[PDB]
Amino acid sequence: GEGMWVPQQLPEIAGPLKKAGLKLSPQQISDLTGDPMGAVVALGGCTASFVSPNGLVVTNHACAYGAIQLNSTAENNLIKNGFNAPTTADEVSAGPNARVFVLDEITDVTKDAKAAIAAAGDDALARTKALEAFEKKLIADCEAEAGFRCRLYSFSGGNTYRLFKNLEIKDVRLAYAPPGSVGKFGGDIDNWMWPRHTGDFAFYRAYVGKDGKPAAFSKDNVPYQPKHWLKFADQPLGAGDFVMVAGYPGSTNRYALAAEFDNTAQWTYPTIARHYKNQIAMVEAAGKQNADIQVKYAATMAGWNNTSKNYDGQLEGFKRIDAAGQKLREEAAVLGWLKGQGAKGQPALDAHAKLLDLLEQSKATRDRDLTLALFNNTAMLGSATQLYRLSIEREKPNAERESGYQERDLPAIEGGLKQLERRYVAAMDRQLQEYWLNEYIKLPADQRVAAVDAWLGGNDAAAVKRALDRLAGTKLGSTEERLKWFAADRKAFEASNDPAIQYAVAVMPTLLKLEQERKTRAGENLAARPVYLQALADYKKSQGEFVYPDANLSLRITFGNVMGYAPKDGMEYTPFTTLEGVVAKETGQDPFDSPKALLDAVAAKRYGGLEDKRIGSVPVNYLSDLDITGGNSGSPVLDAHGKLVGLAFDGNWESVSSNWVFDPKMTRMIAVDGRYLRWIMQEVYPAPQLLKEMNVG
């Protein structure tokens, strides 16, 4: 059921957990560094888990898709063909920015955090900088121990702060991925849909130095030896069985103002969806003619598809459940309840009004802000502006550099500059700049930026062509050139005649002003948001209702039971899909083209000792009433005894609006069955060595 429960709520959900079917004690689950919870790691726009004492890690194919794409080329396309390393020496690096974060300690810092903020008095921007100074000090102290990375989280609008300390594994290698016709069977047609038939899994291996300490890639590094790892279920999963997931959901917005929902539904999601689809069409068209563009833009293209389709789905679900009306009625109730309290209700009412004022400030420039950020997110202008900002920041002492630009951030910045080599073609990027240029010209005069209007010298197709012809002169298209600029000082950027760099230098004062506006807004949110959210919480608690914080990229536990759902009168989705379902969708063309070995094994009924007698086949995917979101991809699904029964990977179509307004009847996790993983590694794209390592072969 509903609830992305933080570890600290475990006492509160131990009753419900046992009634749903958990046979482990909740005390065993409370031990976040023990068995099995200590096996769960963050990637961390995704989740994964160890499944071997020798550092083997399972996650989704969608999670490893960036890694797989980084190691693919047009001639040797691992996305299309799959990858299997027969020995550990055959494993390829997953890229310099691949990470596995293993949890080491959580600490509550609420008191000190609120003290730091309170100290700044009545000034909004000082409030933001005080919290930033606190966070940088706290993290620096925490990361004094080598090999560890720390993160400060805010929960329930600034009512609670906790610091997480993680061992940071820096050398992650690709060990196995199925062919993309299994890992992403059905492609974007099946994305966000049930019935699903997708074997969304892949394996990494974590490596550290011989000293045991984390190290960046090196042929002298050796497999990390996790304290705990998961084991496959020995009992078959069936309908109604207990399941639970622990993972790292990114964000939900269930506590938003009705006005914030209204703007997201009316402007944000349709705007983004549209921009994403425009860019998708262009790049699709270009890739059809050029196999190098196709492989190089594959990961970008997966994200644009996923997010655009998710937004279309949310807009549809909002209409399905009248979300706009449910937010308006619920807020009326909260605001009435507060007014019924005179004195002690006044601060939440004041807070409400301020959040509305801030929403209105943000709206005034929303088109300029979005369009600018996306324009500057193309590969050459993104690189130039990042590199030039770094050069500015390096002039300050480290403690005073903007987060993202401190010494601790250097490894990631540099890694991103190299990774872009596999994700960049100038001919494609020029069409993306052209699209964003044409969108900037349609903005009204009051949403324009002087520095961009000047750099353009006009408002017509000829100015656009000139700007593109000039940017074509940049040398930032080669990796070695981006890395030169990574080390160069401010003056050097300000002297250069590279047109991408000249663009950076000219817009940067403006970027810096917008950031101050965001920081000032965020400073007032820091005062108003905790106060309004405490009042929501107190209202829902007085209503009986569930109280848990919105997702914030920290570790959460959700639980429930395998079950389908009823999309309409006269029908039901069943909880499992089966091998014969995969074959029934076969067309022989992308995205319904399974490997031939899969088609043969199914036709010959080779079930590999993994058949569930209750469904007459080997299960493929299943539905359950768990509460997951973006960031839970790859999370392990554990049964009544803490054994691995699948991996979380998607939501059904009707579920996606639950980010704003939760609908119990139509919100289900979609997961890939562990037996399907095993089946593929037996009969389809064989990996006898990993099965034995795990050890189910």
Binding site: A62, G303, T629, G630, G631, N632, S633, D650, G651
Partner: peptide, 5 residues
């Protein structure tokens, strides 16, 4: 798929 947006 539930990767980060």
């Amino acid at each position: 798929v539930y990767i980060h947006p």
